[PDB]
Amino acid sequence: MISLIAALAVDRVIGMENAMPWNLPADLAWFKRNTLNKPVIMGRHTWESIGRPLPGRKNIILSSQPGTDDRVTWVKSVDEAIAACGDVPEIMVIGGGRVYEQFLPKAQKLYLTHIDAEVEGDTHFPDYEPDDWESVFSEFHDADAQNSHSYCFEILERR
Numbered sequence: 374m375i376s377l378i379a380a381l382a383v384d385r386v387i388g389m390e391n392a393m394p395w396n397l398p399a400d401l402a403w404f405k406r407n408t409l410n411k412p413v414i415m416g417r418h419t420w421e422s423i424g425r426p427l428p429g430r431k432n433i434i435l436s437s438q439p440g441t442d443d444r445v446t447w448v449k450s451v452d453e454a455i456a457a458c459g460d461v462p463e464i465m466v467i468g469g470g471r472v473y474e475q476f477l478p479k480a481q482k483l484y485l486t487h488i489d490a491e492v493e494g495d496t497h498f499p500d501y502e503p504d505d506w507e508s509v510f511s512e513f514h515d516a517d518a519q520n521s522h523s524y525c526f527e528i529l530e531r532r
């Protein structure tokens with residue numbers, strides 16, 4: 374099973390200048406809980422944005438060019454990325470925009486954080502078709518002293 378996990382600001386913005394400009398510790402904790410002990414697939418730009426391997430997860434990087442770091446696994450196509458995960462129950466695709474576009478048709482589940490923040494960005498999550506997806510979990514949180522925007526954790530499953 375392939376799942377996508379992402380945090381979206383207004384208008385599906387996910388990034389600007391290879392960074393995420395907001396800071397929502399509660400959402401990063403949600404990301405860690407939902408990805409730990411699973412393989413994570415990311416594009417090369419997202420690997421550069423994170424800047425280090427994510428511990429406790431098999432890190433698989435898509436790039437058309439040879440890898441430059443043997444602490445992670447490098448692959449050259451979507452099918453190779455999936456194969457490199459082996460026989461696991463759930464593969465987590467962690468972006469960025471180009472990678473989400475390619476894996477969305479293959480995904481059965483979306484873990485989305487909707488952040489009430491207006492961000493100029495240069496990268497968006499794919500337009501997906503709402504009729505294809507059932508919301509099975511949602512949890513809203515107001516802003517607090519640690520999280521400066523309100524946010525909604527949602528899990529959607531392909532109908």
Ligand SMILES: NC(=O)c1ccc[n+]([C@@H]2O[C@H](COP(=O)([O-])OP(=O)(O)OC[C@H]3O[C@@H](n4cnc5c(N)ncnc54)[C@H](OP(=O)(O)O)[C@@H]3O)[C@@H](O)[C@H]2O)c1
Nearest residue numbers: 379380388391392416417418419436437468469470471472
């Ligand atoms: N809010 C969030 O949830 C979230 C999550 C992830 C990322 N982001 C943000 O998203 C932005 C990065 O997204 P992006 O769309 O620019 O880049 P990306 O999807 O992270 O990376 C694209 C790169 O991945 C490689 N790639 C993708 N598909 C491939 C394929 N089928 N075969 C081989 N290589 C492939 C290529 O690398 P080569 O050029 O080396 O061939 C391509 O240039 C950043 O702003 C980051 O902060 C946000």
Ligand SMILES: Nc1nc(=O)c2nc(CNc3ccc(C(=O)N[C@@H](CCC(=O)O)C(=O)O)cc3)cnc2[nH]1
Nearest residue numbers: 378379380400401402404405423427428467468486
């Ligand atoms: N909901 C969501 N939020 C995100 O921030 C997110 N980020 C990415 C890609 N970028 C990043 C950037 C940093 C870390 C990171 O530092 N993660 C630590 C945080 C642990 C914690 O804060 O409790 C990790 O071990 O996962 C992960 C992904 C992909 N999907 C996402 N999905």
Ligand SMILES: [Mn+2]
Nearest residue numbers: 450451452453
């Ligand atoms: Mn092929």
Ligand SMILES: [Mn+2]
Nearest residue numbers: 456459460461
């Ligand atoms: Mn197999």
Ligand SMILES: [Mn+2]
Nearest residue numbers: 489490522523
């Ligand atoms: Mn806000």
